Amino acid sequence: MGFLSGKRILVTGVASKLSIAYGIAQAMHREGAELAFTYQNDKLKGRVEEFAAQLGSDIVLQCDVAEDASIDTMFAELGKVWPKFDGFVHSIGFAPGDQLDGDYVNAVTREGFKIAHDISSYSFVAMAKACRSMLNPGSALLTLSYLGAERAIPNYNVMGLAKASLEANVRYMANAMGPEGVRVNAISAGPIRTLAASGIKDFRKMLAHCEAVTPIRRTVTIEDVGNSAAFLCSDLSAGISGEVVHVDGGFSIAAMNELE
Amino acid sequence: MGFLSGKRILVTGVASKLSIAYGIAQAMHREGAELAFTYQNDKLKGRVEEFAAQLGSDIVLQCDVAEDASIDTMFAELGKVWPKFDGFVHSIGFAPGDQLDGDYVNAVTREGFKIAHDISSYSFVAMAKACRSMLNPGSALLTLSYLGAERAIPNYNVMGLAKASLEANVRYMANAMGPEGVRVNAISAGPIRTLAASGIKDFRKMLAHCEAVTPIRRTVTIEDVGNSAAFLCSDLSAGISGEVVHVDGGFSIAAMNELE
Amino acid sequence: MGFLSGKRILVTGVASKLSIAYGIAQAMHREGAELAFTYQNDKLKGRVEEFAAQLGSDIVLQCDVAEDASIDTMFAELGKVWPKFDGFVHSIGFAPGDQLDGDYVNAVTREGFKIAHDISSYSFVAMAKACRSMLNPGSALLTLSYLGAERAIPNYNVMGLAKASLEANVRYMANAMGPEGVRVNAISAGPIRTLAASGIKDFRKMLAHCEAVTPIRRTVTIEDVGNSAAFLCSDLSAGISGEVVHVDGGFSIAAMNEL
Amino acid sequence: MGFLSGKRILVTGVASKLSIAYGIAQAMHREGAELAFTYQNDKLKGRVEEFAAQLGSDIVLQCDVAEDASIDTMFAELGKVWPKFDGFVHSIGFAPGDQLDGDYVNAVTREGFKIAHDISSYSFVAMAKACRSMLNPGSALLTLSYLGAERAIPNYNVMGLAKASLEANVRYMANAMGPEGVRVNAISAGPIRTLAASGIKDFRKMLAHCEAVTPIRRTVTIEDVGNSAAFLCSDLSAGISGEVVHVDGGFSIAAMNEL
Numbered sequence A, B: 001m002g003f004l005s006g007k008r009i010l011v012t013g014v015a016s017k018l019s020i021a022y023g024i025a026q027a028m029h030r031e032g033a034e035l036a037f038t039y040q041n042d043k044l045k046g047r048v049e050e051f052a053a054q055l056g057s058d059i060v061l062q063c064d065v066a067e068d069a070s071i072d073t074m075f076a077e078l079g080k081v082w083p084k085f086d087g088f089v090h091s092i093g094f095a096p097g098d099q100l101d102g103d104y105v106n107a108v109t110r111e112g113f114k115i116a117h118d119i120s121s122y123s124f125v126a127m128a129k130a131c132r133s134m135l136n137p138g139s140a141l142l143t144l145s146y147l148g149a150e151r152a153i154p155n156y157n158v159m160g161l162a163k164a165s166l167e168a169n170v171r172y173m174a175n176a177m178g179p180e181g182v183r184v185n186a187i188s189a190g191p192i193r194t195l196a197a198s199g200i201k202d203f204r205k206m207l208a209h210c211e212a213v214t215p216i217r218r219t220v221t222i223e224d225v226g227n228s229a230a231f232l233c234s235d236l237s238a239g240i241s242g243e244v245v246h247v248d249g250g251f252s253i254a255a256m257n258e259l260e
Numbered sequence C, D: 001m002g003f004l005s006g007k008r009i010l011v012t013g014v015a016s017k018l019s020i021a022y023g024i025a026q027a028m029h030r031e032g033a034e035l036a037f038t039y040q041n042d043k044l045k046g047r048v049e050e051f052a053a054q055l056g057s058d059i060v061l062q063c064d065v066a067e068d069a070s071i072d073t074m075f076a077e078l079g080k081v082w083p084k085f086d087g088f089v090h091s092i093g094f095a096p097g098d099q100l101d102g103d104y105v106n107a108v109t110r111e112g113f114k115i116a117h118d119i120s121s122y123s124f125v126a127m128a129k130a131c132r133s134m135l136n137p138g139s140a141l142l143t144l145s146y147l148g149a150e151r152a153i154p155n156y157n158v159m160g161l162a163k164a165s166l167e168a169n170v171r172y173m174a175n176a177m178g179p180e181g182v183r184v185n186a187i188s189a190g191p192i193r194t195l196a197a198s199g200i201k202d203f204r205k206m207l208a209h210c211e212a213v214t215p216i217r218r219t220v221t222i223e224d225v226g227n228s229a230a231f232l233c234s235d236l237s238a239g240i241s242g243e244v245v246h247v248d249g250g251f252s253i254a255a256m257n258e259l
Ligand SMILES: NC(=O)c1ccc[n+]([C@@H]2O[C@H](COP(=O)([O-])OP(=O)(O)OC[C@H]3O[C@@H](n4cnc5c(N)ncnc54)[C@H](O)[C@@H]3O)[C@@H](O)[C@H]2O)c1
Pocket: A012, A013, A014, A015, A016, A018, A019, A020, A021, A039, A040, A063, A064, A065, A066, A091, A092, A093, A094, A119, A144, A145, A146, A188, A189, A190, A191, A192, A193, A194, A195, A196, A197
């Protein structure tokens, strides 16, 4: 049992035990949710089937959100076992690595901009389009954003724009799907060393600096994010939609804390 | 049991079964919290002792947050049974009624401004000052705000300023008390017909208009707010501090929905 | 001597006397800037040439911001007469019109999303990239956004996401180009019945509701926007960068009028 | 003919040549406004009289915004020479200095809170109340805020709550007085080492950190603020009301510099 008791939730973006999505699925399973999982490529298929089985799940489906056909086929497959379900977790963010390195205006390109927005923002509503009919009243959709949406952060570059697009997507999706009984929210997570840190310069220094100046004096964990995510996909959060909830330890609401 | 299992939480502001604080205490008791209650005047003493006893609580204490002595005496009394505890719910908002009626610049007065800010904003940190030593690591403080803080709303008038002050109070309190292990948040609730609606002109029309244009197509309840409040005072929300969480059905994130 | 007196500013997006960019151009000329103009396509050439002539400009250049080579060629042409200059006004917004009716989730498509973000957001930084070495210290870049970036507005649909991207683009560009002396801002303008209102359902009522609830009790004009734009590209605004300035008469800061 | 050319504006808060209000007054005079000045107390009279004389003004009036009768008497005096006028600059911020060291929860008191909100927030609407019938259509009111209203800044403490109240006051005043032709805005200025830095711990490093992380790579000046203030009280900004304009060089829109 748990406060996600009679709920069936699809979880994207589990790539490793460090993934934010892994922490979310963990917390959701602990709270009684029945889970289903997607995986981007075949390289990831073995790993996700394993994590799903640890969390009581036989439903592991391929989904590359670059492709409308892949999304449709995956929801068609899901419908064979979950004719209806209660929402999904969107934990997919991507820009070509060279976009995330230097001066933003020099780094950004039309293609890097296109990919970053396509994969990190459009895919969320593409997923909602494809399963809109499958959602129960009381369903909840969730995505992961970052402070780069609201502030100019060195090297985050075009992902910052893509996350700002995603946060607007949350609002427009909540406004369109609310009347039929679906809520849509985001968590704006503090930095976490996941595979999304691969190749990012000065990530350790960024983490240290966050730990010093966040009001809770630590960086957040996939367990912190998972607990908030479970809440936001549960009926306990029935009054919250279209909201970007900061799960950052309070980092974003303070300033000039570094000066001791 | 529940996710507030080993937690002792003080609840202010229970005035009637309609109070937001009543809904919060209900949800908190359901989730296993041990509760204590304050009451403003003796007129309210009988009623609150009753609600507290329904929720398994013998701890009902007088507290007029206009008075530093009253706050100190109440925490001294509380310490006799709760030497330490795990946070409190601040559900106190007040401005002299004549402040909340007409054109803001004509209505507001120095004294109405003083009272509104004193009772609705300063009292939150006055309460934290008085019990700071009593708080356990992992404690959480919560207050109730309203969209009037962020937007100019007809007739809300100086309460709008007082709520903006309160939301800044949340941030400064979270920044000062985080390192020692206390989180501080607010819920920005949608309108609810409580005793805070007494004498407010066009409250029914305001409620109707909210129900039409909120993405979830209903107004929020003290049960919605109570569930979010329970979460935000629980260890499930360990990664959230200094945040104003909108529990408004998405009302604040949409615009020009009234035009059908 | 106006407060843009020694400045040379490139103005995109003039398509009619109703355009926001026409109001911006007039104001900037009124304050003594020297101006240059771009036109999207051959359909619009003759009109932009005429408008530029009325404002005393000989510099009228094609620029279709869908294409990197079009932007590059335009700035190479501009460099023949303006080897360095002091910024540009980005007044370009576009999504396929089918994107802007009805339920947002049903209306949006991958291609409609792509185009809206490419044309309305990426093109701002694409332009900055192509002219970065031509920008004098003290330069200012300016774009136009809308409250649909911040709040879910019926029918604005994917343009709201595109504008949210554009406002983030403002911050990232300001952060990147500030050290070399360039400021980057946006105006978030209230609704104006320009060519950008074409085919949009219930535009007249939206203005009417806006005229009723805005604090100043009227909708804004391209004159209002042009005056704020001139300030934002002038040295008077040397302390402002990365900012989205609301020029909507206070509409966005109000709530709960009419019920 | 400057862009405030036919305007009469009352300027509060000139206490030294370093004051933000001194930079605002100079800019407004430069743009052709006629000016009037208030002074808090007898300590400051002689200096404000001198400054007003340098800017060509004979109108120098006492006003202690702690007291309703002081504000009323000042506007009665002003009405003898300016029966109607076009707005005022509110440049008044104050909390007892013990409020602005150390841990916020330990530093704040009921009285320190009262004073900070009374003097820094209520006094803006108190002034508007006392001169409302004297305001010409097209009038503009302006106040100064700081980023401590929006984010928790060490040591700024209760002034951050007071500034958050003041920014809400801007919105509520703009909403109330817009129908009669008055706009109300604020400038959220970056840190400037004025008399308001007196006794504030680590002010020099805060400027140094600010100079490093702000996009424009310098802190702002009273010249930068005065130019934005002149625009905001001029008819050039007729489309802007209820707005908090950040004039901090883009500091607030950045994060994660230095680590
Ligand atoms: N790690 C942080 O600091 C942090 C903080 C806030 C938000 N985020 C965001 O959290 C979300 C999860 O990232 P993470 O930190 O768990 O790292 P991660 O690498 O473990 O998860 C990212 C997942 O995106 C999936 N993905 C990428 N392209 C895809 C595609 N075309 N189709 C389907 N799936 C695709 C990947 O397979 C991966 O599983 C991302 O959106 C990220 O931007 C990360």
